[PDB]
Amino acid sequence: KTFKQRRTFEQRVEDVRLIREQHPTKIPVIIERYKGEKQLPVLDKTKFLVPDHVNMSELIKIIRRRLQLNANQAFFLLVNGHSMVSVSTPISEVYESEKDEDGFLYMVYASQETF
Numbered sequence: 001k002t003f004k005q006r007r008t009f010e011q012r013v014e015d016v017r018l019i020r021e022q023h024p025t026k027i028p029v030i031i032e033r034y035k036g037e038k039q040l041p042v043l044d045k046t047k048f049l050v051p052d053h054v055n056m057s058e059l060i061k062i063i064r065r066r067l068q069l070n071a072n073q074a075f076f077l078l079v080n081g082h083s084m085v086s087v088s089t090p091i092s093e094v095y096e097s098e099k100d101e102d103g104f105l106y107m108v109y110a111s112q113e114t115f
């Protein structure tokens with residue numbers, strides 16, 4: 001069902017190594033809906049190549065646009081399992097501290113802060 005379940009650790013590692021070789025300026029991000037989540041839609045895909053200069057505040061703007069949300073729909077984003085301390089951090093810096101051992105940056109969204 002989830003990305004980690006669909007691909008072996010070996011497979012996730014090799015895919016990140018390909019993104020490094022073919023899209024060296026991009027951050028490999030997994031973005032998944034919370035398994036509880038009722039309100040917000042599912043995305044058209046799971047694996048995203050994010051430009052390494054965008055900060056977390058702009059990535060939230062991007063995901064809201066991709067989900068085609070309106071002004072009063074609530075949106076919460078967990079990174080590597082927990083809340084973001086800051087949305088002003090460049091994703092290149094967030095990646096280096098919050099990346100998984102497979103080399104993806106894992107994110108989960110919901111309409112409640114209570115995930």
Ligand SMILES: CC(=O)NCc1cncs1
Nearest residue numbers: 014016017018019020021
């Ligand atoms: C394409 C690519 O990055 N793979 C090389 C690596 C093998 N050992 C660590 S990374």
Ligand SMILES: CC(=O)NCc1cncs1
Nearest residue numbers: 048049050051062063066
């Ligand atoms: C569009 C692109 O190149 N990657 C950034 C994205 C992150 N989440 C949705 S797309």
Ligand SMILES: [Cl-]
Nearest residue numbers: 023024025026
């Ligand atoms: Cl690139």
